[PDB]
Amino acid sequence: HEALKKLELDPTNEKRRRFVIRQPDGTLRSAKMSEMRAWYWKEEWADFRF
Amino acid sequence: KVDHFHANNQYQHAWPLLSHDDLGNSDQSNNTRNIMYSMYLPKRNKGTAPWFRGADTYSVKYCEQGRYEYQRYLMINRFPSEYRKHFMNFLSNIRSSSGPATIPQEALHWLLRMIVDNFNPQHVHYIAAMKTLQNAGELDMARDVWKIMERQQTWPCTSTICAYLDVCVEAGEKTWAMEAWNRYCTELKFLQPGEVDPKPVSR
Amino acid sequence: AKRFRYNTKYPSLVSYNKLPWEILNHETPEFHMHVAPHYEQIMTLAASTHVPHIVGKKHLEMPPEHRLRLLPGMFYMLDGDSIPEGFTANRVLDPTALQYYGRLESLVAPVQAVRMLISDDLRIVCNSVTLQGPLQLPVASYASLASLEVVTNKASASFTLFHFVRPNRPPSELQLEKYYIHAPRAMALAEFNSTSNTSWEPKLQAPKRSKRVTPLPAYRPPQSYLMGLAERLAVVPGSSFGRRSLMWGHWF
Amino acid sequence: ARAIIKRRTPQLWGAPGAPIIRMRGHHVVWKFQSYDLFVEHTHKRRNSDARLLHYLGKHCPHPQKSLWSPDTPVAQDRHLFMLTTVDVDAFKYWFGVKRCRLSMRPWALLAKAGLLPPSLRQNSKIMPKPIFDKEQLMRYYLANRKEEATIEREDYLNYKNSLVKSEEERAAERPVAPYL
Amino acid sequence: SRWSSVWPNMHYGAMYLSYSIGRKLPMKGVNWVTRESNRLTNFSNRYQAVINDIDVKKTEEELGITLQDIRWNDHRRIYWKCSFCGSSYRKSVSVRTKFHAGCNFCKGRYPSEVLREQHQSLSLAASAPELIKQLKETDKKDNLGSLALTSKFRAEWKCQSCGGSYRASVRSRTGMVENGQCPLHPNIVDWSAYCPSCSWRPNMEAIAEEVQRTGQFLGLEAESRKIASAPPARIPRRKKLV
Amino acid sequence: RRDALNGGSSMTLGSKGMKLSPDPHRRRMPWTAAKEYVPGVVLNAKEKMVLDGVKLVDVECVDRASQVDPLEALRATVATYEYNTSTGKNIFQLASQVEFDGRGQRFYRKEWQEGTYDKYVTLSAIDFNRDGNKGTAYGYVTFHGETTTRPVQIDFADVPGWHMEFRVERAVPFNAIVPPPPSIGTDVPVDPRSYRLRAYPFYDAPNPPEFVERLLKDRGVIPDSP
Amino acid sequence: DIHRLKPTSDFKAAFKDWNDLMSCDKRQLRVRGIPRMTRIAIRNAVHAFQNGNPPEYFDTKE
Amino acid sequence: QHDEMRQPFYIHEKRHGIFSNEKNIRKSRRGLPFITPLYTRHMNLWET
Amino acid sequence: RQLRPYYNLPSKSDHGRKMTGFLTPYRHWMWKQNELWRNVHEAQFEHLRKVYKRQWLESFRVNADEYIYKYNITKAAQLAQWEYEMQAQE
Amino acid sequence: RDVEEKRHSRDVVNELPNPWTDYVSHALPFPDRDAGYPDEYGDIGQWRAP
Amino acid sequence: PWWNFQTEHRQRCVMMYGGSRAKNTHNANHRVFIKKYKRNAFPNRTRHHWAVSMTGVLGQRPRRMPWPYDLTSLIFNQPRQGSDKIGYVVGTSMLKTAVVAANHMVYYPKFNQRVSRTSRFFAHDEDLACVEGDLVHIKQCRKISKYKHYYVFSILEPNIEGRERLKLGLKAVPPPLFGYPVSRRIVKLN
Amino acid sequence: ASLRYRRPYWMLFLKDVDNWKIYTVIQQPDHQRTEMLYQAWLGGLDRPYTRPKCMANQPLWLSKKRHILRKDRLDGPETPLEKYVLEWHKRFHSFQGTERPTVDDLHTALDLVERPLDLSYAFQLLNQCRNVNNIRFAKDT
Amino acid sequence: ERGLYFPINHRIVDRRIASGVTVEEADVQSRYRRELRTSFATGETRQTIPPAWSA
RNA sequence: UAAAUUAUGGUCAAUUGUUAGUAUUCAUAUUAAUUUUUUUAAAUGUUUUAUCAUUUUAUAAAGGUUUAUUUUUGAAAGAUUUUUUGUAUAAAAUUUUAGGAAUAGUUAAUAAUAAUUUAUAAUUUUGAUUAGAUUGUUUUGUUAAUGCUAUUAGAUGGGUGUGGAAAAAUAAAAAAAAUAAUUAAUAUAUAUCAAUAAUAAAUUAAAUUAAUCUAUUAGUCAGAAAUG
Ligand SMILES: [Zn+2]
Ligand SMILES: [Zn+2]
């Protein structure tokens, strides 16, 4: 739930979102941050301030 | 919803951008920065700016919430006979949920799920649920049934105090029982010779 | 597959899908099919303990108005065969009925004769099974058949069982089950107290066996065209007894 | 159980069938073909809803690239990715607790997930199916034996309750002097 | 019929299919014509191995296009022959001069597309001449004797059973893989040492040998070999939670 | 339901079997329980090719018009009998011959001695219909030692697949009720020399090596070339 | 060749050798004029064999 | 067809007891035009 | 399906079925190596169908416990407010 | 099962949690927090806050 | 997709990033009315038909709609809508049976306004107490006949005038002076 | 492959009758006189009759009436065995009998032989006691 | 021919009869429209009930 | 009947027509269409079973409906050593047509009643019954927007009353009781009513597997552009 991406991408949250990448050698591993962020609707950020 | 021509639920959550072949705009080698803004990021109407449902376009009070606080006391009333139905059902299902396969904890689960259902577990739903975990020797569970009865701030009737007290017997902890004594089964007085034995139901 | 709750479907003034009412009929071998394996447990009973109404001294004497008021369900064993009053007797030699009494006779004194008696009222039928000879049971001194003077007397004791009922009646009002009290054989223990106590030496351990088991004859797999995997087929290991996951001994 | 059966579309038994974790997906042009993974019953009406239980996810049969991560010098990461979104916890409740039938293409996926063991029909054609014999099977169990006192535990805490209220830290629930 | 219209799939190399009216028109009207500064052969100094890998006869005969008629950036779809391996394709001088795009088989002579030269994965001749004898004769073995053991090069070889031509990866043959790729089967040696149909036999030999030795076939024998041979010394075990 | 295989499993649909329940599966379909069926089609396939050149006589071939040479009617008797013994003998053709209707004699269909199967039917009664070869055949069943405790009706008597090795000891007349066989654990104690049990409730015989080398050959562990 | 609608017998010619039966794909078969229900069934049985099932199953046209 | 412009599913559970749409899934004439009226709402709205 | 081996027992009959289900004892033995490598398989597949009742319940336990610990603070606080507004109304 | 468990315990890389198999993170039916949904007025989850 | 522009469309199969998949039905079609009768020959009597109908329900327009927020939901909490209904019991002449006439809520979104509406119900009353007019509470149950799914769950005010009117003997309520509206000039003289 | 649905219930478990679809439709008034004629055709009766509401297998009673009124052939009984053969084909060949022949009633028929004709007759009664009624001949047959 | 088909006057389901019993085992035919009759149709005036001794 | 801010807090509302004295949602525009273009479909033989039988496999033909369509474990999921239970038909809100009026196996109570039981019965102008169009309540189009204007396909009686549920006389593209098979999504020219292609419509080329297609009309007084 994109409203709560900063929650569901925080290790301290036990209800964290779960992503797994099974490499092509069968080894399971857990996501990269970039892939985690891929699964939400596109996040724009540009601080015009300075 | 699903597998009709117009699938909705697969777009209902967020899938990254599939660039596997020319789905029309040479999606697979053409990388499509501006094509996404103008074209595939949905819009507020034809031509309006790209609406971004992003995870940074939601208000920062959304992350700072504790759990289940959005949930308000829901006082749900159900017909009388419908009360009876669902009562006998969560009773039957604390006694036995699945036929032969249950873990002991299915009463406990069914007591809670009675709670989460915004239901009022009667004392019979407590007696039952305490017997069925005593039988199974899940006494820490027959205790947490006490604690559920207590977090409910409920008044264990004589039957229920006897029940939990058996549990203290079997687990062998005097403390566990001393508080039930201190709390509830103190104003219990033996039947003095003059007074009526089974004082009638009153309310 | 379990049992549903209520008939919500049909007008109950016309009984529709109801499994029909079993009626044991005295004419046909079904009567004895049901009342036959029951007698053997009342025999093991009256050979273990004393139960009152079994070992009478004679018939019951009651007017034909009250005959059906006490008898129906009366079952007792007399010293010898003798038709009670107000009855006629019909011997039976049908082998398809007699066949059942095999388990009766191979556990107690073998059965000599079998009759069906009908009252002159036509409405009280007494299956009367007369037994013969030395019993196979170690009848206990404090039995009822022990007071029947049969095990006291030597061989050639012809005692006889009677079971009265009304006819055309289901196997429910055949009050022959209420004596299914199971009492064991203590005569078996009676060895270790009398003069065999110094004669018998018991061994508590096992002896040193240096020899493994001699194997069965080598297995020749079947050669007929088999039904198939008796697991997948829902057929109990011998179509007789066992567990469908304990599929021992069906061809393999 | 029907007078004139529906011919291409009979299942085994009954009108509302057992729940099954199917992985459907509409047949249009391959480029536009991705799979609606979802719990549902066997015997449906013509569409995928009337015995739809619980949308379970979506699969992309088309292996996509690392255009969400940078260009690593790491092979297994540069390989195409095949992506799917499950409903892990309602799958556990349906499959595990309500016992819905796990069809073979969906299983082919979740096997790759790591939830379920790799299926029956991921047949390594290149190795034969096994040869069972009681002599060797019992001779092994003879050789290596595990105990009742190590097996009953795992049986319990693997099919029955497993939150061991640590006997020591059940002390935190046995009150102190004001009520002890 | 109908499915004639379906576009041919495009992968992660294929750029613009040019499969509709406006998809070709604005590129159709580019009436190219070869001038002396267009002429590829004027540019041998820079593009010597682009000159030396042209199937010239295959081109002219089939196309009506001459080695002289070739631009250095000619968009015409001509045929070439790899001067490293020796396979034939139909590739335009444009996507071969702009991008260094070539033979679909010499695409993988280098072990991993990503890190192509860094591989110190050893060569073929200086490492394993027992492949140098089974590889198909090319007269380019003088150069292929440097292909890495880890190369995905779909190299063609002589089999030993059917004598014929079987094409397999140099790595899928040799067995060893550069540290950190997708590794290949434990038995890929024994299941590509032969022909795609005659690689069956050298396998079930040791498989039935154990059905005989043990009266029972269970793939777990390699496992149990590894436990009866390789004791773990100190493999850290996690503090239990129960 | 009551006893499905390995419990209730669902990695397939076939993991239960071609029926999940030794019980019926409806209370309105009593017959659909699981009995040990023995082929009805192929073991009611009476070879008509034994009965071709015989010039049969029908029960309306009673006319003098149709009466045949008694030598050819003898051809007809030998033909009809060889015609019924084509697959085998029904029990009602087995134990019409043996004295006392074979009561007490332990029958067995052919499989009931082959494999781990070890069973007989210490038959207890036989009753014949007007047409013989049909009727009600009751018998104290005996599996791997243990008998029923009452005479049950015997299934697939009226199919031709039977045998019996009449031993004179079991000749039980029409006057004495069949004394039921003893079971080897209960009614008679066990001896390790007179009877030894073929297979127990756990037992499964080692692999027939002809079957192991057929399966190897087919599944391509044993090379199989023409 | 079991099904009266999967007559795999009719096209023993389209394949030259055993390997060109075991290595033609389900689209390589539409290359070879083999109609729909035929080539799917060919592919079924071919992959059954590939594993170790020989097509030893009964013929029900009749 | 977006959900943010919709009141979520779990509110029919919070109204009619958790997992009580399933007993209507398993119904007979479920799907032809009508279904069991699914009471997803804001909770701050119930007439009840 | 239930396979129709060409070495089944062909019911030599024109009315029902030219091939019946009646194995040659090779089949009832081959069918063995068939239906035990599936029960080697669906031993883990039904070992899980429980483990995901040890996992989905030993999680609904914790989470309904926590949902009630929070909906109880909420239930109790809204109940208190109803009592208070009852006072101010009086 | 036994020989596979022997080799699995022999595998060092194992004995790590695969959070897809180990727990059902939120088994109840409803989220732990209001997630961008509408409000009494329809103020869709973006036009509001909790 | 919908948010895309006609010529910027490519592929009507999928939706690439997100949005609403839906079939752009063709509302713009000039539905018509084929006159199959004559302005003086119609096989109806009351409501003649002479132009296209707008069809639907929860679709007609003015868009009336269900609204539970009425008197009933202000007074009673309910398990399911319509359970509890308060009205002037009107009509009880069917022995042991009451007709309770109580209102619901019909909200008009376009206008931003309401009108609650009338309905003569059936309501069982074992023992025949209520008289026409007692403001009563009525609750739902299991059905009681073809048409009564309700029962008189209380009285909120008994028409004491009426009860005494019966006790004295007269009709607890005089009957309406005139009938239903007719079309014939009924000439009552003397 | 169950005909449970296509035909009415009581016709569950009807085999070896041909084309039962006529009794399904036997109530419809045209088929009614159609079978009024088929029953009169089969005869044995006098007044109109059809097989009752839900019967396809003709009544056991009517089948016995026709099976006993069908005149037994051999109107020329002369020798002992022709009389005995009429009696035997009334005993063990009247409809639905429960008695099965006796070797002692084969003996009498077998001992009424004068001619090769009676040789054939008692020989066929041997045929039947051998193969139709499944009996055991005496020791001395 | 002059009313509903399965009237609710006779629509009754008694639950002091065990489960399944009316399904497939046994018929319980009775007259339930007198045990389901109301105090307004009989006359039961619920008098104060005295207990044992005072009775 | 008080100002206040610890400074944009809680996430985009915004209307683009050349008219013709004036009053008035009303020709010409743009958006969504339809008219319009073959890149989504498609085949026959359901399948087991012990056998002339039986186990398994239940809402697309119409049928004309606006006080309308509603229901369960007993089938199955489904796990044990046996007899094992109380959860279902009900509803509730919304119902069209210019000129508007009477309708009827009837209403309630008794009832496991009354083809002739009792009665001051019931539907209706809060718009009934007849007849007419019409598939019924998260799918669109336009609009900044209350609106206006859309969404399919599915339930058309009972008659031996089988089944868990009549929904049952042919019209998947669900693997359908042994792992068949997925190296597969491809489907030949066959169809339904869905499904918007003119996909860089004109100079620099397609790190392809070289596959389909040769590509066009408008106006020319107002108002871009005219004469013979
Ligand atoms: Zn090359
Ligand atoms: Zn080779």
Coordinates of N, CA and C in Angstrom, one line a residue, chain B residues 3-4 28 33 38 48 53 57 64 72 80-81 94 98 109 120 123 134 138 153 157-158 167 186 198:
Chain B
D3 N -9.8 -12.8 -15.8 CA -9.7 -13.6 -17.0 C -10.9 -13.3 -18.0
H4 N -11.8 -12.4 -17.7 CA -12.5 -11.8 -18.8 C -11.6 -10.9 -19.6
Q28 N 10.8 -2.5 -26.0 CA 11.8 -3.5 -25.5 C 13.2 -2.9 -25.7
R33 N 11.3 7.0 -21.0 CA 11.1 8.1 -20.0 C 9.9 8.9 -20.3
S38 N 3.9 11.0 -20.7 CA 2.8 11.3 -21.6 C 1.8 10.2 -21.7
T48 N -4.8 15.7 -19.1 CA -4.4 16.3 -17.8 C -3.1 15.8 -17.4
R53 N 0.4 7.9 -8.4 CA -0.2 7.4 -7.2 C 1.0 7.0 -6.2
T57 N 3.4 10.5 -2.7 CA 2.2 11.4 -2.8 C 1.1 11.0 -1.9
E64 N 2.9 7.1 10.2 CA 3.2 7.2 11.6 C 2.1 6.6 12.5
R72 N -12.6 1.5 14.8 CA -13.4 2.1 15.8 C -14.3 1.1 16.4
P80 N -32.1 -11.8 17.6 CA -31.9 -12.7 18.8 C -31.5 -14.1 18.4
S81 N -32.4 -14.7 17.6 CA -32.1 -16.1 17.1 C -30.7 -16.1 16.4
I94 N -15.3 -24.2 19.0 CA -14.2 -24.3 20.0 C -14.0 -25.7 20.5
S98 N -12.1 -28.6 12.9 CA -12.1 -29.7 11.9 C -12.4 -31.0 12.6
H109 N -8.1 -20.3 19.0 CA -8.3 -19.5 17.8 C -9.8 -19.2 17.6
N120 N -19.3 -11.4 21.7 CA -19.2 -11.5 23.2 C -19.1 -12.9 23.6
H123 N -19.8 -17.2 29.1 CA -19.0 -18.0 30.0 C -19.0 -19.5 29.5
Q134 N -7.5 -28.0 28.5 CA -7.0 -28.8 29.6 C -6.9 -30.3 29.1
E138 N -2.7 -28.2 26.9 CA -2.2 -26.9 26.6 C -2.8 -26.0 27.7
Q153 N -12.3 -8.0 30.5 CA -12.9 -7.5 31.8 C -14.2 -8.2 32.1
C157 N -17.9 -16.5 36.5 CA -18.9 -17.1 37.3 C -18.3 -18.3 38.0
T158 N -18.9 -18.8 39.0 CA -18.4 -19.9 39.8 C -17.9 -21.0 39.0
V167 N -7.0 -25.6 36.2 CA -5.9 -25.3 35.4 C -4.7 -25.0 36.3
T186 N -14.0 -14.4 46.2 CA -14.0 -13.9 47.6 C -15.3 -13.7 48.1
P198 N -30.9 -22.5 46.0 CA -30.6 -22.0 44.7 C -31.4 -20.7 44.4

